[PDB]
Design an enzyme around this catalytic site. Structure first.
Site, PDB file in Angstrom:
ATOM      1  N   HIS C 201       0.811  -1.213   0.000  1.00  0.00           N
ATOM      2  CA  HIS C 201       0.000   0.000   0.000  1.00  0.00           C
ATOM      3  C   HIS C 201       0.846   1.266   0.000  1.00  0.00           C
ATOM      4  N   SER C 205      -0.267  -0.243  -6.604  1.00  0.00           N
ATOM      5  CA  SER C 205      -0.266  -1.412  -7.470  1.00  0.00           C
ATOM      6  C   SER C 205       0.311  -1.079  -8.846  1.00  0.00           C
ATOM      7  N   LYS C 227     -15.986  -5.976  -9.912  1.00  0.00           N
ATOM      8  CA  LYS C 227     -15.105  -6.802 -10.730  1.00  0.00           C
ATOM      9  C   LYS C 227     -14.585  -7.995  -9.939  1.00  0.00           C
ATOM     10  N   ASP C 228     -14.165  -7.769  -8.692  1.00  0.00           N
ATOM     11  CA  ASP C 228     -13.709  -8.878  -7.862  1.00  0.00           C
ATOM     12  C   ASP C 228     -14.864  -9.790  -7.478  1.00  0.00           C
ATOM     13  N   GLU C 271       1.469 -34.823  -4.314  1.00  0.00           N
ATOM     14  CA  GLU C 271       0.269 -34.245  -4.893  1.00  0.00           C
ATOM     15  C   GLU C 271       0.622 -33.422  -6.129  1.00  0.00           C
TER      16      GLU C 271
HETATM   17  C1  LIG Z   1      -7.759  -6.385  -5.811  1.00  0.00           C
HETATM   18  O1  LIG Z   1      -8.062  -5.388  -4.853  1.00  0.00           O
HETATM   19  C2  LIG Z   1      -8.034  -5.865  -3.523  1.00  0.00           C
HETATM   20  C3  LIG Z   1      -6.964  -5.356  -2.554  1.00  0.00           C
HETATM   21  O2  LIG Z   1      -6.016  -4.405  -2.989  1.00  0.00           O
HETATM   22  C4  LIG Z   1      -6.557  -3.107  -3.140  1.00  0.00           C
HETATM   23  C5  LIG Z   1      -6.922  -5.873  -1.112  1.00  0.00           C
HETATM   24  O3  LIG Z   1      -6.094  -5.472  -0.360  1.00  0.00           O
HETATM   25  C6  LIG Z   1      -7.963  -6.891  -0.638  1.00  0.00           C
HETATM   26  C7  LIG Z   1      -7.901  -7.424   0.828  1.00  0.00           C
HETATM   27  C8  LIG Z   1      -7.131  -8.779   0.776  1.00  0.00           C
HETATM   28  C9  LIG Z   1      -7.951  -9.788   1.131  1.00  0.00           C
HETATM   29  C10 LIG Z   1      -9.061 -10.714   1.709  1.00  0.00           C
HETATM   30  C11 LIG Z   1      -6.973 -11.037   0.992  1.00  0.00           C
HETATM   31  C12 LIG Z   1      -6.582 -11.731   2.380  1.00  0.00           C
HETATM   32  C13 LIG Z   1      -6.251 -10.530   3.334  1.00  0.00           C
HETATM   33  C14 LIG Z   1      -6.629  -9.970   4.517  1.00  0.00           C
HETATM   34  C15 LIG Z   1      -6.486  -8.917   5.652  1.00  0.00           C
HETATM   35  C16 LIG Z   1      -7.533 -10.804   5.564  1.00  0.00           C
HETATM   36  C17 LIG Z   1      -6.774 -12.024   6.251  1.00  0.00           C
HETATM   37  C18 LIG Z   1      -7.751 -13.169   6.727  1.00  0.00           C
HETATM   38  C19 LIG Z   1      -7.794 -13.473   8.059  1.00  0.00           C
HETATM   39  C20 LIG Z   1      -7.479 -13.472   9.591  1.00  0.00           C
HETATM   40  C21 LIG Z   1      -8.878 -14.636   8.259  1.00  0.00           C
HETATM   41  C22 LIG Z   1     -10.308 -14.067   8.704  1.00  0.00           C
HETATM   42  C23 LIG Z   1     -11.330 -15.212   9.087  1.00  0.00           C
HETATM   43  C24 LIG Z   1     -11.840 -16.407   8.688  1.00  0.00           C
HETATM   44  C25 LIG Z   1     -12.183 -17.770   8.018  1.00  0.00           C
HETATM   45  C26 LIG Z   1     -12.886 -16.743   9.846  1.00  0.00           C
HETATM   46  C27 LIG Z   1     -12.253 -17.580  11.049  1.00  0.00           C
HETATM   47  C28 LIG Z   1     -12.577 -16.875  12.419  1.00  0.00           C
HETATM   48  C29 LIG Z   1     -13.739 -16.538  13.061  1.00  0.00           C
HETATM   49  C30 LIG Z   1     -14.698 -15.876  14.089  1.00  0.00           C
HETATM   50  C31 LIG Z   1     -14.942 -16.924  12.066  1.00  0.00           C
HETATM   51  C32 LIG Z   1     -16.337 -17.476  12.593  1.00  0.00           C
HETATM   52  C33 LIG Z   1     -16.589 -18.969  12.978  1.00  0.00           C
HETATM   53  C34 LIG Z   1     -17.795 -19.059  13.562  1.00  0.00           C
HETATM   54  C35 LIG Z   1     -19.055 -18.471  14.270  1.00  0.00           C
HETATM   55  C36 LIG Z   1     -18.179 -20.531  14.055  1.00  0.00           C
HETATM   56  C37 LIG Z   1     -19.491 -21.123  13.350  1.00  0.00           C
HETATM   57  C38 LIG Z   1     -20.297 -21.698  14.559  1.00  0.00           C
HETATM   58  C39 LIG Z   1     -21.492 -21.094  14.817  1.00  0.00           C
HETATM   59  C40 LIG Z   1     -22.950 -20.617  15.114  1.00  0.00           C
HETATM   60  C41 LIG Z   1     -21.726 -21.933  16.158  1.00  0.00           C
HETATM   61  C42 LIG Z   1     -20.765 -21.189  17.179  1.00  0.00           C
HETATM   62  C43 LIG Z   1     -20.999 -21.381  18.714  1.00  0.00           C
HETATM   63  C44 LIG Z   1     -20.148 -20.788  19.583  1.00  0.00           C
HETATM   64  C45 LIG Z   1     -18.932 -19.985  20.093  1.00  0.00           C
HETATM   65  C46 LIG Z   1     -20.778 -21.194  21.020  1.00  0.00           C
HETATM   66  C47 LIG Z   1     -20.063 -20.698  22.359  1.00  0.00           C
HETATM   67  C48 LIG Z   1     -20.770 -21.190  23.670  1.00  0.00           C
HETATM   68  C49 LIG Z   1     -20.243 -20.913  24.887  1.00  0.00           C
HETATM   69  C50 LIG Z   1     -19.375 -20.317  26.028  1.00  0.00           C
HETATM   70  C51 LIG Z   1     -21.265 -21.558  25.927  1.00  0.00           C
HETATM   71  C52 LIG Z   1     -22.017 -20.450  26.786  1.00  0.00           C
HETATM   72  C53 LIG Z   1     -23.100 -21.116  27.679  1.00  0.00           C
HETATM   73  C54 LIG Z   1     -23.776 -20.374  28.580  1.00  0.00           C
HETATM   74  C55 LIG Z   1     -24.848 -21.038  29.468  1.00  0.00           C
HETATM   75  C56 LIG Z   1     -23.477 -18.870  28.748  1.00  0.00           C
HETATM   76  C57 LIG Z   1      -9.031  -7.408  -1.610  1.00  0.00           C
HETATM   77  C58 LIG Z   1     -10.072  -8.446  -1.144  1.00  0.00           C
HETATM   78  C59 LIG Z   1      -9.066  -6.893  -3.053  1.00  0.00           C
HETATM   79  O4  LIG Z   1      -9.897  -7.287  -3.807  1.00  0.00           O
HETATM   80  C1  HEM Z   2      -0.405 -16.555  -0.386  1.00  0.00           C
HETATM   81  C2  HEM Z   2      -1.309 -15.595  -0.173  1.00  0.00           C
HETATM   82  C3  HEM Z   2      -1.229 -14.219  -0.876  1.00  0.00           C
HETATM   83  C4  HEM Z   2      -2.179 -13.287  -0.804  1.00  0.00           C
HETATM   84  C5  HEM Z   2      -3.515 -13.403  -0.040  1.00  0.00           C
HETATM   85  C6  HEM Z   2      -1.757 -12.142  -1.578  1.00  0.00           C
HETATM   86  C7  HEM Z   2      -2.474 -10.982  -1.750  1.00  0.00           C
HETATM   87  C8  HEM Z   2      -2.167  -9.979  -2.638  1.00  0.00           C
HETATM   88  C9  HEM Z   2      -3.062  -8.933  -3.078  1.00  0.00           C
HETATM   89  C10 HEM Z   2      -4.529  -8.765  -2.631  1.00  0.00           C
HETATM   90  C11 HEM Z   2      -2.401  -8.157  -3.938  1.00  0.00           C
HETATM   91  C12 HEM Z   2      -2.961  -6.912  -4.659  1.00  0.00           C
HETATM   92  C13 HEM Z   2      -4.039  -7.333  -5.654  1.00  0.00           C
HETATM   93  C14 HEM Z   2      -3.457  -8.264  -6.685  1.00  0.00           C
HETATM   94  O1  HEM Z   2      -2.230  -8.192  -6.943  1.00  0.00           O
HETATM   95  O2  HEM Z   2      -4.224  -9.074  -7.261  1.00  0.00           O
HETATM   96  C15 HEM Z   2      -1.055  -8.676  -4.065  1.00  0.00           C
HETATM   97  C16 HEM Z   2      -0.054  -8.160  -4.855  1.00  0.00           C
HETATM   98  C17 HEM Z   2       1.192  -8.717  -5.021  1.00  0.00           C
HETATM   99  N1  HEM Z   2       1.577  -9.981  -4.621  1.00  0.00           N
HETATM  100 FE1  HEM Z   2       0.547 -11.181  -3.328  1.00  0.00          FE
HETATM  101  N2  HEM Z   2      -0.515 -12.422  -2.108  1.00  0.00           N
HETATM  102  C18 HEM Z   2      -0.154 -13.692  -1.701  1.00  0.00           C
HETATM  103  C19 HEM Z   2       1.026 -14.321  -2.030  1.00  0.00           C
HETATM  104  C20 HEM Z   2       2.014 -13.806  -2.840  1.00  0.00           C
HETATM  105  C21 HEM Z   2       3.163 -14.533  -3.324  1.00  0.00           C
HETATM  106  C22 HEM Z   2       3.470 -16.015  -3.020  1.00  0.00           C
HETATM  107  C23 HEM Z   2       3.899 -13.713  -4.074  1.00  0.00           C
HETATM  108  C24 HEM Z   2       5.220 -14.126  -4.767  1.00  0.00           C
HETATM  109  C25 HEM Z   2       5.868 -13.307  -5.597  1.00  0.00           C
HETATM  110  C26 HEM Z   2       3.242 -12.417  -4.091  1.00  0.00           C
HETATM  111  C27 HEM Z   2       3.663 -11.277  -4.741  1.00  0.00           C
HETATM  112  C28 HEM Z   2       2.902 -10.152  -4.970  1.00  0.00           C
HETATM  113  C29 HEM Z   2       3.354  -8.937  -5.611  1.00  0.00           C
HETATM  114  C30 HEM Z   2       4.777  -8.704  -6.160  1.00  0.00           C
HETATM  115  C31 HEM Z   2       2.329  -8.080  -5.649  1.00  0.00           C
HETATM  116  C32 HEM Z   2       2.333  -6.652  -6.236  1.00  0.00           C
HETATM  117  C33 HEM Z   2       1.358  -6.582  -7.406  1.00  0.00           C
HETATM  118  C34 HEM Z   2       1.508  -5.262  -8.113  1.00  0.00           C
HETATM  119  O3  HEM Z   2       2.341  -4.435  -7.668  1.00  0.00           O
HETATM  120  O4  HEM Z   2       0.798  -5.037  -9.124  1.00  0.00           O
HETATM  121  N3  HEM Z   2       2.094 -12.517  -3.326  1.00  0.00           N
HETATM  122  N4  HEM Z   2      -0.950  -9.792  -3.260  1.00  0.00           N
END
Ligand SMILES: COC1=C(OC)C(=O)C(C/C=C(\C)CC/C=C(/C)CC/C=C(\C)CC/C=C(\C)CC/C=C(/C)CC/C=C(\C)CC/C=C(/C)CC/C=C(\C)CC/C=C(\C)CCC=C(C)C)=C(C)C1=O
Ligand code: HEM
Ligand SMILES: CCCCCCCCCCCCCCCCCC(=O)OC[C@H](COP(=O)([O-])OCC(O)COP(=O)([O-])OC[C@@H](COC(=O)CCCCCCCCCCCCCCCCC)OC(=O)CCCCCCCCCCCCCCCCC)OC(=O)CCCCCCCCCCCCCCCCC
Ligand SMILES: CCCCCCCCCCCCCCCCCC(=O)OC[C@H](COP(=O)([O-])OCC(O)COP(=O)([O-])OC[C@@H](COC(=O)CCCCCCCCCCCCCCCCC)OC(=O)CCCCCCCCCCCCCCCCC)OC(=O)CCCCCCCCCCCCCCCCC
Ligand SMILES: COC1=C(OC)C(=O)C(C/C=C(/C)CC/C=C(\C)CC/C=C(\C)CC/C=C(\C)CC/C=C(/C)CC/C=C(\C)CC/C=C(\C)CC/C=C(/C)CC/C=C(\C)CCC=C(C)C)=C(C)C1=O
Ligand SMILES: COC1=C(OC)C(=O)C(C/C=C(\C)CC/C=C(/C)CC/C=C(\C)CC/C=C(\C)CC/C=C(\C)CC/C=C(\C)CC/C=C(\C)CC/C=C(\C)CC/C=C(\C)CCC=C(C)C)=C(C)C1=O
Ligand SMILES: CCCCCCCCCCCCCCCCC[C@@H](O)O[C@H](CO[C@H](O)CCCCCCCCCCCCCCC)COP(=O)(O)OCC[N+](C)(C)C
Ligand SMILES: CCCCCCCC/C=C\CCCCCCCC(=O)OC[C@H](COP(=O)(O)OCCN)OC(=O)CCCCCCC/C=C\CCCCCCCC
Ligand SMILES: CCCCCCCCCCCCCCCCCC(=O)OC[C@H](COP(=O)(O)OCCN)OC(=O)CCCCCCCCCCCCCCCCC
Ligand code: HEM
Lengths: 80, 106, 379, 62, 52
Positions: C201, C205, C227-228, C271
C-alpha cells in the site's frame, strides 16, 4: 427588495410579458407562497432531486472530484 | 561493414520496433522506460511543454489499453519520426551520479 | 458534519485499505487473483474448522473418523470435498499470482516480493501436513519419504528427523503433532498476508504497461468491488463443478485404503501441486545434492530482481522475453508430467534435461536476451 | 418493450429502498419454492423408474 | 434526557415512521423465511405446499 428601483421593475414587466404573457402581481405571489408547507416541499423535492441523474462540470485542480458513479450513488439513501 | 550492413542493421532494428507494439498506442520509445530515481530526476528537468505532451500520451495509452483497443494505422508512431527527447537529460544525470560515486570511493 | 469513515479509527483503516485507495484503471483480470487467494484462505479455514469438530488425530481412529464424517455426519461429504478441492484451487491461484509478477515485473517491489516468498513456503507446509491427516496409504508413505530426506544433512540430519518424528518411525505422535501445526499455521499466514498488503500500500499497485499510472488512478470501491465479485462468482463456479460432478479426479486413489506400514505401494507420488519439485530432486544422483537443488530452485525466485537487467519493467514490449517465458512455462508442465511417471530411462533423461533447462533459462538466457533487446533499441 | 410496466414497478417499489428490500424478500421466498419444485421435477423425469420414490409403492403397505 | 423534546423532534419521528414500519416488516419476513417457521408459514397460500 429586488423590485426596488425603476430599472428592475421595467425588467420584470418585459421578462414576464415574454414568459407568462402577464405580470403576476405581488398579492398573487404571496398567496402562492403561503400555500407552501413542509409536506409540499418534501413531495416536490422528491419529484426532482431524488434518484435523478445529475450533470457535473469541473474546471480547476479536480483530481479529488469523485467519479460520476460515486456522485450518482449519493443522490439517494440506503436508509430511506 | 559500412553502407553494406548498417542499412541491413537498421532493417532488423525497425523490425523489432514494429514487433514492440507501443507505437500502436501512440507511445514514443522514451515514454516506455522504467521510472527509477534517475528517470524521475530527468523528468523533473523537462520543459513544461514536453512534460505536458508526455503526460497526455501516457494517459491516452492507458485509456486505450483499458478499452482493449488500438489506434488506427494512420495514427501509429513511425520508426523514422520518433524523437529521443529524454536522452540528453538521462545522460547528464547518469554522468553526475557516476562522478559522485567515483569521488566517493577515494 | 464530515463522513464518519474518515474519523473513526477502525473506519480509517477500512477506508484506506478497501474503499478509497487509488488503483490503476487498466489492471486486467490477472490482478484479480490476489483477492481470490484470500477468499480461498477464508473458505479453507471455515470448512476445515467444521471438519475439526469431528476429526480424531490418532493412528487408529483417524481413518475411521473420516469415514464417519463422509457418511453419518450431515453434509460431511460436501464439506470434506470443498476443503480438499479448495486446496487445489488455492495453489492454482497462487501459481497464477506468482506468474503475473514475473511477466509484468511486479518483483521490482522488493519488500512486497520477498514477503510473498515466505507466504508461499508457509502455504506449502500447511498443505503438506494436511495431506497426512487422512492417514491413508499414500499419506503415510508420502510423509515417510519427504521426511527421511533430511538424513542427508551433514551431521545433524539423523538427529533432526527422529526429533520431528517423536520416535524411531512415523506413528500417532507425528499425526497429532502435524494436526496442531496444520491448525495453527494458516492463521500465521493470515497475519503475514496483512504485511503483504501493508508494504504494497505504501507504493501502489502496478499496471500491465509498466508505466506509472498516477495520471489515471481510480477509487477502488465501485469498479473493482464488482469486478472482484465477478471473479469470485467464477471461482465458485469452478470449485462447485469440481466437487459436485467429479470430486475425485484431482486426487489420487489408493488413499482410500488404511495405511499399512509393512506395504510399500509400487508408485509413490506427491500431490499434483508438488510434483514439479519431486522430479527436480529425483533426477540429481546425490541425495544431498537433490535437496540442495530443490532449495536453490525455490530461492531463485528471490534472486529474480537481481538478474533483471532490462530497461523496461513489463515484458509486454519484449517479444523475445515472452517466448522464453512461455518456454519456461512449458518446461514446468514437462516437470509436472514426469513427476507422475515411474522411474525409467526415457523419463529420467527427460527430467534431467528439463531440470538443467529450467535453471539455465532463469540464470543465463533471460539476462542475455534482455541485454540484446536493450542493444536493439539503442538505449 | 413494456416501458409502462417497468415505469410502474419503479414508481411503486423501487424509488424507496425499504420497499426495494421487501420485494426482494418476497421474491426469493416465491422463487425458491418454484425453483426447487421445478428442478426436482426435472430430476425425477430424467431418472424415471429408478428412484426409490418410484418403486416404494411396490413394498410399502405391501 | 430533556433536550430531545420539542415540536420538531415529534415531527421528525412522524416522517420516519413509515420507513420504520417497512424496515420492521422486512426483518420479520426475513426471519420467518430464514428459519422456515412452519407456524406462520402454514397460512401462506402457495409456500405452505413445501411442508411434504
Ligand atoms: C484487488 O483489490 C483488492 C486489494 O487491494 C486493493 C486488497 O487489499 C484486498 C484485501 C485482501 C484480502 C481478503 C486477501 C486476504 C487478506 C486480509 C487482511 C484478511 C486475512 C484473513 C484473516 C485473519 C482470516 C479471517 C477469518 C476467517 C475464516 C474466519 C475464522 C474466524 C472466526 C470468528 C470466524 C467465525 C466462525 C464461527 C461463528 C463458528 C461457526 C459456529 C457457529 C454458530 C456456532 C458457534 C458457537 C459458539 C462460540 C458457542 C459458544 C458457547 C459458549 C461459552 C457456551 C455459553 C453457555 C452459557 C450457558 C453462557 C481485496 C479483497 C481486493 O480485492
Ligand atoms: C499466499 C497468499 C497471498 C495473498 C492473499 C496475496 C495478496 C495480494 C493482493 C490482494 C495483492 C494486490 C491485488 C493483486 O495483486 O491481485 C497482491 C499483490 C502482489 N503480490 Fe501477493 N498475495 C499472496 C502471495 C504472494 C506470493 C506467493 C507472491 C510471490 C511473488 C506475491 C507477490 C505479490 C506482488 C509482487 C504483488 C504486487 C502486485 C503489483 O504491484 O501489481 N504474493 N498480493
Ligand atoms: C483487526 C486487528 C486490527 C489491528 C490494527 C493494527 C494496525 C494499526 C494501524 O495501522 O494504525 C492504527 C494506529 C494509529 O494509526 P497509524 O499508525 O497512523 O496508521 C493508520 C493508517 O491508516 C495505516 O495506513 P494503511 O491503511 O495504508 O495500512 C494498512 C494496514 C494497516 O496496518 C496493518 O494492518 C498491518 C499489521 C500487521 C500485523 C501482522 C504483523 C506480524 C506478521 O493494513 C493493511 O495492509 C490492509 C489489511 C486488510 C484488512 C483490513 C481490515 C480492517 C478492519 O496505530 C496503532 O498504534 C495501533 C496499534 C495496534 C496493534 C498494537 C500491537 C501491540 C503488540
Ligand atoms: C433462530 C433460532 C432457530 C431455532 C428454531 C428453528 C427450528 C424451529 C423449531 O425447532 O421448532 C420451534 C418452532 C416451530 O418451528 P417448525 O418449523 O415447526 O420446526 C422445525 C424443526 O426445526 C424441525 O426439526 P427436525 O428434527 O425435524 O429437523 C432437523 C432440524 C432441527 O435443527 C435445528 O433446529 C437447529 C437449531 C439451531 C439454531 C441456532 C443457530 C444459531 C445459533 O434442522 C433443520 O432441518 C434446519 C432447521 C433449523 C434452523 C436452521 C436455520 C437457522 C439459521 O419454530 C420457531 O418458533 C422458529 C424460531 C424463530 C423465531 C424466534 C422465536 C424466539 C422468541
Ligand atoms: C516431492 O516432495 C516434496 C514436496 O511434495 C510432497 C514438497 O511440497 C516440498 C516443500 C516443503 C514443504 C512442506 C516442506 C518445507 C517447509 C519449509 C522450508 C519451511 C519450514 C517452516 C515451517 C512450518 C514454519 C514456517 C515459518 C513461519 C511463520 C515463520 C515466519 C513468521 C513471521 C511473522 C514472518 C515475519 C518476517 C518478518 C519481519 C521479516 C520482514 C521482511 C521481509 C520479507 C523482507 C525481505 C528481507 C531480506 C534480506 C530479503 C531481501 C534481499 C535483497 C536485495 C537481496 C536479494 C536476495 C538474494 C537471495 C539474491 C519438498 C521440499 C519436497 O521434497
Ligand atoms: C503498560 O504499558 C503498555 C502498553 O500501553 C501503554 C501497550 O500497549 C503494550 C503493547 C504490547 C502488549 C500487551 C504486548 C502483547 C500484545 C498483544 C495483542 C498480545 C498478542 C499475543 C500474540 C500473537 C501471541 C504470541 C504467541 C503465539 C502464536 C505463539 C508463538 C509460538 C508459536 C507458533 C510456535 C513457535 C515454535 C515453537 C515452540 C517450536 C516448536 C516447533 C518446531 C520446530 C516445528 C516442528 C516442525 C514442523 C511444522 C514441520 C515443518 C516442516 C515440515 C513437514 C517438512 C520440512 C521438509 C522436509 C524435507 C522434512 C505494552 C507491552 C505495555 O507495557
Ligand atoms: C454469507 C455468505 C455470503 C456469500 C456471498 C457470495 C456472493 C458471490 C457473488 C457476488 C455477487 C455480487 C453482486 C451482488 C449484488 C449485485 C447488485 C448490487 O451490487 O447492487 C447494490 C445492492 O444494493 C442493495 O440492493 C441496496 C438495498 C439493500 C437490500 C438488502 C436486501 C437484504 C435481503 C436479505 C435480508 C436477510 C435478513 C435476515 C434476517 C434474519 C446497489 O444497487 P442499486 O441499484 O445501485 O441501489 C439503488 C437503490 N434504489 C433502488 C432504492 C434506488
Ligand atoms: C507450476 C506449473 C504451472 C503449469 C501451468 C502452465 C499454464 C497454463 C496457462 C498459462 C496461461 C494461459 C493464459 C494466457 C494465454 C496467453 O498467452 O494470453 C496472451 C497474453 C499476452 O498478452 P500481453 O503481452 O500481456 O498484452 C496484453 C494486451 N495486448 O498472455 C499474458 O498476458 C500472460 C501474463 C501472465 C499470466 C500468467 C501466465 C501463466 C503462468 C504460469 C506459470 C508462470 C510461472 C510460475 C513460476 C512459479 C511456479 C511455482
Ligand atoms: C459483493 C460485494 C460487492 C457488491 C455489493 C456491495 C455494493 O454493491 O456496494 C454498493 C452498495 C450501494 O451503495 P452506493 O450506491 O454505492 O453508495 C452509498 C449509497 N449512497 O452498498 C452496499 O453495500 C449494498 C449492500 C448492503 C446494503
Ligand atoms: C490455506 C489453508 C488450508 C489448506 C491449504 C489446507 C489443506 C488441506 C488438505 C490438502 C487436506 C487434505 C484433505 C484430503 O486429502 O482429503 C486437509 C485436511 C484437513 N484439514 Fe485443511 N487446510 C487448510 C486449513 C485448515 C484449517 C484452518 C483447519 C482447521 C481449523 C483444517 C483442518 C483440516 C482437517 C480436519 C483435515 C482432515 C480432512 C480429511 O482428512 O479429509 N485445515 N487440509
Amino acid at each position: 427588495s429586488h423590485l426596488d428601483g425603476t430599472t428592475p421593475v421595467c425588467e420584470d414587466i418585459g421578462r414576464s410579458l415574454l414568459t407568462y404573457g402577464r405580470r403576476i402581481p405581488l398579492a398573487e405571489w404571496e398567496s402562492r407562497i403561503a400555500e407552501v408547507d413542509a409536506s409540499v416541499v418534501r413531495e416536490i423535492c422528491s419529484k426532482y432531486i431524488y434518484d435523478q441523474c445529475p450533470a457535473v462540470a469541473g474546471y480547476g485542480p479536480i483530481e479529488q472530484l469523485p467519479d460520476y458513479n460515486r456522485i450518482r450513488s449519493g443522490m439517494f439513501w440506503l436508509r430511506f | 561493414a559500412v553502407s553494406a550492413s548498417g542499412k541491413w542493421l537498421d532493417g532488423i532494428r525497425k523490425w523489432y520496433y514494429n514487433a514492440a507494439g507501443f507505437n500502436k498506442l501512440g507511445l514514443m520509445r522514451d515514454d516506455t522506460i522504467y521510472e527509477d530515481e534517475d528517470v524521475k530526476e530527468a523528468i523533473r528537468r523537462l520543459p513544461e511543454n514536453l512534460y505536458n505532451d508526455r503526460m497526455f500520451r501516457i494517459k491516452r495509452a492507458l485509456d486505450l489499453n483499458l478499452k482493449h483497443q488500438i489506434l488506427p494505422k494512420e495514427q501509429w508512431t513511425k520508426y523514422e519520426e520518433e524523437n529521443f527527447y529524454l536522452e540528453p537529460y538521462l545522460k547528464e544525470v547518469i554522468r553526475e551520479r557516476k562522478e559522485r560515486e567515483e569521488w566517493a570511493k577515494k | 458534519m464530515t463522513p464518519m469513515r474518515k474519523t473513526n479509527p477502525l473506519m480509517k483503516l477500512i477506508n484506506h485499505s478497501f474503499i478509497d485507495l487509488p488503483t490503476p484503471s487498466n489492471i486486467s483480470a490477472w490482478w484479480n487473483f490476489g483477492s481470490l487467494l484470500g477468499a480461498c484462505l477464508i473458505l479453507q479455514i471455515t470448512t476445515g474448522l467444521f471438519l475439526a469438530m469431528h476429526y480424531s488425530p490418532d493412528a487408529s481412529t483417524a481413518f475411521s473418523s473420516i469415514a464417519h464424517i463422509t457418511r453419518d455426519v450431515n453434509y460431511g461429504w460436501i464439506i470434506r470435498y470443498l476443503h480438499a478441492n479448495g486446496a487445489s484451487m488455492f495453489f492454482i491461484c497462487l501459481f497464477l499470482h506468482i506468474g503475473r509478477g514475473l511477466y509484468y515485473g511486479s518483483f521490482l517491489y522488493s519488500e512486497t516480493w520477498n514477503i510473498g516468498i515466505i507466504l508461499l513456503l508457509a502455504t506449502m507446509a500447511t498443505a503438506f501436513m494436511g495431506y497426512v491427516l487422512p492417514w491413508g496409504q499414500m499419506s503415510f508413505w508420502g510423509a515417510t519419504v519427504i521426511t527421511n530426506l533430511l538424513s542427508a544433512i551433514p551431521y545433524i540430519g539423523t538427529d533432526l528427523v527422529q526429533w520431528i518424528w517423536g520416535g524411531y518411525s512415523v506413528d500417532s505422535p507425528t499425526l497429532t503433532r502435524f494436526f496442531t501445526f496444520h491448525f495453527i499455521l494458516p492463521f500465521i499466514i493470515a497475519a503475514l498476508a496483512t504485511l503483504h498488503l501493508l508494504f504494497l500500500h505504501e507504493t501502489g499497485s502496478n499496471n500491465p504497461l509498466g508505466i506509472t499510472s498516477h495520471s489515471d488512478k481510480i477509487t477502488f470501491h465501485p469498479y473493482y468491488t464488482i469486478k472482484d465479485a465477478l471473479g469470485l462468482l467464477l471461482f465458485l463456479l469452478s470449485l462447485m463443478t469440481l466437487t459436485l460432478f467429479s470430486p475425485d479426479l484431482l486426487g489420487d486413489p489408493d488413499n482410500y485404503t488404511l495405511a499399512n506400514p509393512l506395504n510399500t505401494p509400487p508408485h509413490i507420488k506427491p500431490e499434483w501441486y508438488f510434483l514439479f519439485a519431486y522430479t527436480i530432486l529425483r533426477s540429481v544422483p546425490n541425495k544431498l545434492g537433490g535437496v540442495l537443488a530443490l532449495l536453490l530452485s525455490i530461492l531463485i525466485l528471490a534472486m529474480i530482481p537481481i538478474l533483471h537487467m532490462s530497461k523496461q519493467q513489463s515484458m509486454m514490449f519484449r517479444p523475445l522475453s515472452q517466448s522464453l517465458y512461455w518456454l519456461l512455462a512449458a518446461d514446468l508442465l514437462i516437470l509436472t508430467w514426469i513427476g507422475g511417471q515411474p522411474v525409467s530411462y526415457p523419463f529420467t533423461i527427460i527430467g534431467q534435461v528439463a531440470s538443467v533447462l529450467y535453471f539455465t533459462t532463469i540464470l543465463i538466457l533471460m539476462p542475455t536476451i534482455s541485454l540484446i533487446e536493450n542493444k536493439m533499441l539503442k538505449w | 418493450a413494456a416501458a409502462t410496466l417497468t415505469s410502474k414497478l419503479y414508481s411503486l417499489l423501487f424509488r424507496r429502498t425499504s420497499t426495494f428490500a421487501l420485494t426482494i424478500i418476497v421474491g426469493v421466498m416465491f422463487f425458491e419454492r418454484a425453483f426447487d419444485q421445478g428442478a426436482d421435477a426435472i430430476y425425477d423425469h430424467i431418472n424415471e423408474g429408478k428412484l426409490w420414490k418410484h418403486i416404494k409403492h411396490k413394498y410399502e403397505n405391501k | 434526557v430533556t433536550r430531545f423534546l420539542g415540536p420538531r423532534y415529534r415531527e421528525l419521528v412522524k416522517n420516519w415512521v413509515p420507513t420504520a414500519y417497512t424496515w420492521g416488516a422486512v426483518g420479520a419476513v426475513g426471519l420467518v423465511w430464514a428459519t422456515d417457521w412452519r407456524l406462520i408459514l402454514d397460512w401462506v397460500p402457495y409456500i405452505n405446499g413445501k411442508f411434504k
